Design an enzyme around this catalytic site. Structure first.
Site, PDB file in Angstrom:
ATOM      1  N   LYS A   7      19.893  -2.271   5.574  1.00  0.00           N
ATOM      2  CA  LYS A   7      19.804  -2.572   4.157  1.00  0.00           C
ATOM      3  C   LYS A   7      21.066  -3.236   3.654  1.00  0.00           C
ATOM      4  CE  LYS A   7      15.644  -1.393   2.894  1.00  0.00           C
ATOM      5  NZ  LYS A   7      14.816  -2.468   2.263  1.00  0.00           N
ATOM      6  N   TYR A  64      18.548   2.605   9.137  1.00  0.00           N
ATOM      7  CA  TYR A  64      17.978   2.089   7.897  1.00  0.00           C
ATOM      8  C   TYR A  64      19.064   1.603   6.961  1.00  0.00           C
ATOM      9  CZ  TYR A  64      15.704   2.954   3.196  1.00  0.00           C
ATOM     10  OH  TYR A  64      15.188   2.953   1.939  1.00  0.00           O
ATOM     11  N   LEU A  91       0.805  -1.239   0.000  1.00  0.00           N
ATOM     12  CA  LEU A  91       0.000   0.000   0.000  1.00  0.00           C
ATOM     13  C   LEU A  91       0.826   1.271   0.000  1.00  0.00           C
ATOM     14  CD1 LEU A  91      -2.726  -0.799   2.696  1.00  0.00           C
ATOM     15  CD2 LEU A  91      -2.832  -1.180   0.192  1.00  0.00           C
TER      16      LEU A  91
HETATM   17  N1  LIG Z   1      10.516   5.363  -1.823  1.00  0.00           N
HETATM   18  C1  LIG Z   1      11.807   5.464  -2.075  1.00  0.00           C
HETATM   19  O1  LIG Z   1      12.321   6.629  -2.546  1.00  0.00           O
HETATM   20  C2  LIG Z   1      12.682   4.217  -1.809  1.00  0.00           C
HETATM   21  C3  LIG Z   1      14.062   4.315  -2.029  1.00  0.00           C
HETATM   22  C4  LIG Z   1      14.894   3.212  -1.808  1.00  0.00           C
HETATM   23  C5  LIG Z   1      14.391   1.981  -1.370  1.00  0.00           C
HETATM   24  N2  LIG Z   1      13.017   1.852  -1.161  1.00  0.00           N
HETATM   25  C6  LIG Z   1      12.495   0.558  -0.662  1.00  0.00           C
HETATM   26  O2  LIG Z   1      11.228   0.241  -1.146  1.00  0.00           O
HETATM   27  C7  LIG Z   1      10.470  -0.367  -0.045  1.00  0.00           C
HETATM   28  C8  LIG Z   1       9.052   0.355  -0.019  1.00  0.00           C
HETATM   29  O3  LIG Z   1       9.245   1.790   0.144  1.00  0.00           O
HETATM   30  P1  LIG Z   1       8.053   2.818   0.052  1.00  0.00           P
HETATM   31  O4  LIG Z   1       8.693   4.080  -0.281  1.00  0.00           O
HETATM   32  O5  LIG Z   1       7.016   2.292  -0.865  1.00  0.00           O
HETATM   33  O6  LIG Z   1       7.645   2.678   1.593  1.00  0.00           O
HETATM   34  P2  LIG Z   1       6.273   3.213   2.301  1.00  0.00           P
HETATM   35  O7  LIG Z   1       6.630   3.578   3.694  1.00  0.00           O
HETATM   36  O8  LIG Z   1       5.566   4.191   1.412  1.00  0.00           O
HETATM   37  O9  LIG Z   1       5.407   1.881   2.209  1.00  0.00           O
HETATM   38  C9  LIG Z   1       5.639   0.846   3.128  1.00  0.00           C
HETATM   39  C10 LIG Z   1       4.484  -0.122   3.222  1.00  0.00           C
HETATM   40  O10 LIG Z   1       4.992  -1.234   4.059  1.00  0.00           O
HETATM   41  C11 LIG Z   1       3.994  -1.446   5.109  1.00  0.00           C
HETATM   42  N3  LIG Z   1       4.401  -2.178   6.388  1.00  0.00           N
HETATM   43  C12 LIG Z   1       4.952  -1.702   7.524  1.00  0.00           C
HETATM   44  N4  LIG Z   1       5.113  -2.702   8.405  1.00  0.00           N
HETATM   45  C13 LIG Z   1       4.671  -3.807   7.825  1.00  0.00           C
HETATM   46  C14 LIG Z   1       4.559  -5.130   8.229  1.00  0.00           C
HETATM   47  N5  LIG Z   1       4.984  -5.464   9.461  1.00  0.00           N
HETATM   48  N6  LIG Z   1       4.056  -6.073   7.363  1.00  0.00           N
HETATM   49  C15 LIG Z   1       3.623  -5.725   6.155  1.00  0.00           C
HETATM   50  N7  LIG Z   1       3.696  -4.457   5.744  1.00  0.00           N
HETATM   51  C16 LIG Z   1       4.218  -3.487   6.559  1.00  0.00           C
HETATM   52  C17 LIG Z   1       3.306  -0.032   5.351  1.00  0.00           C
HETATM   53  O11 LIG Z   1       1.958  -0.194   5.745  1.00  0.00           O
HETATM   54  C18 LIG Z   1       3.298   0.574   3.960  1.00  0.00           C
HETATM   55  O12 LIG Z   1       2.082   0.219   3.296  1.00  0.00           O
HETATM   56  C19 LIG Z   1      11.326  -0.249   1.233  1.00  0.00           C
HETATM   57  O13 LIG Z   1      12.066  -1.450   1.432  1.00  0.00           O
HETATM   58  C20 LIG Z   1      12.252   0.861   0.829  1.00  0.00           C
HETATM   59  O14 LIG Z   1      13.521   0.815   1.503  1.00  0.00           O
HETATM   60  C21 LIG Z   1      12.163   2.985  -1.372  1.00  0.00           C
END
Ligand SMILES: NC(=O)c1ccc[n+]([C@@H]2O[C@H](COP(=O)([O-])OP(=O)(O)OC[C@H]3O[C@@H](n4cnc5c(N)ncnc54)[C@H](O)[C@@H]3O)[C@@H](O)[C@H]2O)c1
Ligand SMILES: NC(=O)c1ccc[n+]([C@@H]2O[C@H](COP(=O)([O-])OP(=O)(O)OC[C@H]3O[C@@H](n4cnc5c(N)ncnc54)[C@H](O)[C@@H]3O)[C@@H](O)[C@H]2O)c1
Lengths: 319, 320
Positions: B147, B143, B10
Site C-alpha cells: 500500500k 499488505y 462486491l
Molecule cells: N475494509 C476496510 O476496513 C479497509 C480499510 C483500509 C483500506 N481498504 C481498502 O479498500 C479496498 C476494498 O476493501 P474491502 O474491505 O471492501 O475488501 P473485500 O476483501 O471485502 O473486497 C474485495 C473485492 O475485491 C475482489 N477481487 C479480488 N481479486 C480480484 C481481481 N483479481 N480482480 C477484480 N476483483 C478482485 C474480491 O472478489 C472482492 O469482491 C482494498 O484496497 C482495501 O485495502 C479497506
C-alpha cells in the site's frame, strides 16, 4: 561462503565480482547476468559466468538449486533517468526480480544483499545529513521501486528470519565502465572530457551538491556489511556515503590534478530536476557504529586514480 | 454527471459504495465489476451494469474501460492484512499488478482514479498518537508494504503524467451489509453478530487495543466528496481520515448500553493482535478536513444503535 551475483556485468557487478573472486576464490563465486560479457569486458572467457534472466523465476531457482549459495548480491535494476523514460521496464525489473530473489533467499536460506539508493528519498527527506529513517517521497519510479525493495526485504526479515541486508548507495564513480546518460554519470563524463581535452556539456548545475563514493570504498563496504554478524546489525537498510561534491567542485579537482583548465558549459538536462530532489549529504553514523563502514578516498585521491586508470582501461590519451 | 467504474465492487467497501454512486449519479452512469459474480442474496444481484472482470487480465481490464469510457474509477481489489500474511504471493500479485494496470489505464483514457490506502501502511515508527499525513512508513505486513508502494506509484503518476490520482488511508471500516471475515478490524463486526445471537465472541485483539475506525455512512460521504473536489483544492494526493478510535472493551461497553444486557467476550490473542498493535492508535486528518471538507456524523453509540438494528433486517439475525 558461496556467493551468487545477479546483474553482475554492469558497473557495480563487474568490480564486485572480481573483488569477491579474489577474496573467496573463483570456485566459491558464481556470476550471472541476462547478457554475456563482451570481448573487451573483464569477465570474458572466465568460467563461473552464467546467463540468467532474473524475470524467469524458475530459471532463477534452477541456478540457485545447483550452486547452493550462502550469499547473494541481487543487482539488476533500471535506474533513475532511464526509468523515467522506460517505466514499464523499471517496474518489471526492479519489483519482480527482487520479489523472486527474496523468495529464493527465504526457501534456500541465503543471506541476501539488495542495494537501495539515495534516489529513494525526495524533497521531504531533510536534505542536509539525511537520516536512515525519515519521510520517503521519491520523484522517480526507480526511487519508488527501491522504497518497495527496502520495505519488502525488511518484511521478509521480520516474517521469515531472511537475513536481508542493504545500503543506500550514493552516486558511484568508477573507471572500468564507460559513461551513460545517468544522473550521477556526468562525473564519469568530465574525467573522459578532460582526458580527450574536449568540451564537457554538463547537465547538472554547477553548484548542485550530491553524495558520491569512489568504487574501492564501495567494494570494501559491500563485503564488510555481508561479513558482519547478524547480532551487530541494528537495522536492515543503512545510508552510506563517501563525500559530497558539486560539478564545479569536481572540475576544480580535475584541474588541480591535470594542472590545466578544462572546458565545461552548464546546460541543464533531465538529471538536474532529479538530482535536486535528492539529499545533498547523508548521515551514516549507524553504518559506522554497527559494522565499520569507512572511506579511504577523498575527491583528489579519486581524480588522481581516475585520470590514471581511464587511459589504461579504454585507451584515451594519457595525461 | 461523471461515469464511474468500480472494480473490486462486491466486497465490503464496494457493495455500499456501488449503491451510493448509483443513487447519486444514476444507475446508467455507474459500471461495477469484480472477479466473481454476485450470489443471489448479494445487494448487487439482479442489477444492471455489474460485470465479471479479473483485474489481473490487463487485456480484459482495458476492453471494459474502452467500452465504458469512465471519467472516474474506484480501484478496490486488494488482499488485506491478516490474509496477506498467510497468502503473501497472492497479496503481491493483486495489490501490485492490478494497481499498475489501473494506473496505466487511468493515464491512457483520462480517468480520475481513487485507490484506497490504509492505516496498515504505517508501522511502529510512525508516531502512534495523532499520526501525520507525512511521516516515517515502516509497515510490518506485506499488505502494508504493497500500500506504501500504491501511494508512491500513484503520486508518481500524478507528477509524471498529470494523472488525477487521489487516495485516503482508511481506518477500520464498520458496516452491516457485509458478513464479517477473518481480517483485523473485522473482530468488531463479529462482536455485533455475537451479541444479537447471544453467543460467545472469542476476540483475537486484546481488550485495550485502540484503533482508528469509521462508520460506513461517513466513509461513503468522504469517498464521494474527495472525488468531487476540484483538483486545485487538493494540496496532496494521499490523505489520512478518521472517524473515532476504540478498543474491544470500549466496543463491548457500547453494545451493552444498547442491548441493555451483557455480551460474553473472551480474549484469546490471535494474529490480528501483533499487526494491529503496530498501527496508529489515532490519526491527524486536518489536511483532509481543510482541503475538501472531510467530516464525520457518527460516534460509537450512534454506530452501535444502527448496527444492532440493521443486522437483523439485512441478514435475518435475531432482532434488538
Ligand atoms: N475494509 C476496510 O476496513 C479497509 C480499510 C483500509 C483500506 N481498504 C481498502 O479498500 C479496498 C476494498 O476493501 P474491502 O474491505 O471492501 O475488501 P473485500 O476483501 O471485502 O473486497 C474485495 C473485492 O475485491 C475482489 N477481487 C479480488 N481479486 C480480484 C481481481 N483479481 N480482480 C477484480 N476483483 C478482485 C474480491 O472478489 C472482492 O469482491 C482494498 O484496497 C482495501 O485495502 C479497506
Ligand atoms: N551505480 C550507481 O551509481 C548506483 C547507485 C545506487 C544504487 N545502485 C544499485 O546497484 C545495482 C547495480 O547498479 P549498476 O550501476 O551496476 O547498474 P548497471 O545498469 O550498470 O548494471 C545492471 C546489470 O543488470 C543487468 N540486468 C538487466 N535486466 C536483468 C535481468 N532481467 N536479469 C538479470 N540481469 C539483468 C544488466 O544487463 C546489467 O548488467 C542496482 O540495483 C542499482 O540501483 C547503483
Amino acid at each position: 561462503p558461496r556467493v551468487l551475483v545477479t546483474g553482475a556485468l554492469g558497473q557495480i557487478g563487474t568490480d564486485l565480482s572480481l573483488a569477491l573472486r579474489d577474496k573467496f576464490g573463483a570456485d566459491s563465486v558464481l556470476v550471472s547476468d541476462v547478457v554475456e560479457p563482451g570481448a573487451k569486458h573483464p569477465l570474458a572467457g572466465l568460467k563461473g559466468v552464467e546467463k540468467l534472466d532474473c524475470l524467469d523465476s524458475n530459471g532463477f531457482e534452477k541456478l540457485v538449486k545447483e550452486f547452493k549459495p550462502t550469499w547473494m548480491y541481487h543487482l539488476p535494476a533500471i535506474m533513475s533517468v532511464r526509468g523515467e523514460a522506460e517505466p514499464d521496464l523499471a517496474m518489471d525489473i526492479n519489483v519482480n526480480t527482487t520479489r523472486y530473489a527474496l523468495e529464493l533467499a527465504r526457501k534456500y536460506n541465503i543471506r541476501i544483499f539488495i542495494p537501495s539508493t539515495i534516489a529513494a528519498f525526495g524533497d521531504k527527506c531533510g536534505k542536509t545529513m539525511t537520516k536512515d529513517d525519515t519521510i520517503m517521497n521519491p520523484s522517480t519510479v526507480y526511487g519508488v521501486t527501491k522504497v518497495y525493495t527496502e520495505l519488502l526485504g525488511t518484511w521478509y526479515r521480520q516474517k521469515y528470519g531472511v537475513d536481508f541486508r542493504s545500503v543506500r548507495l550514493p552516486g558511484i564513480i568508477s573507471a572500468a565502465t564507460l559513461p551513460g546518460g545517468g544522473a550521477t554519470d556526468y562525473a564519469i563524463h568530465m574525467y573522459h572530457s578532460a582526458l580527450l581535452q574536449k568540451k564537457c556539456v554538463c547537465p547538472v548545475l554547477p553548484y548542485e551538491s550530491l553524495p558520491m563514493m569512489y568504487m574501492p570504498d564501495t567494494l570494501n563496504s559491500l563485503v564488510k556489511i555481508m561479513e558482519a554478524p547478524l547480532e551487530k546489525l541494528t537495522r536492515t537498510v543503512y545510508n552510506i556515503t563517501g563525500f559530497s561534491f558539486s560539478p564545479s567542485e569536481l572540475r576544480f579537482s580535475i584541474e588541480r590534478c591535470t594542472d590545466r583548465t578544462i572546458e565545461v558549459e552548464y546546460v541543464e538536462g533531465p538529471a538536474q530536476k532529479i538530482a535536486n530532489s535528492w539529499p545533498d549529504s547523508l548521515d551514516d553514523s549507524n553504518a559506522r557504529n554497527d559494522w565499520g563502514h569507512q572511506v579511504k578516498y577523498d575527491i583528489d585521491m579519486m581524480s588522481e586514480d581516475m585520470l590514471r586508470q581511464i587511459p589504461i582501461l579504454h585507451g584515451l590519451p594519457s595525461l
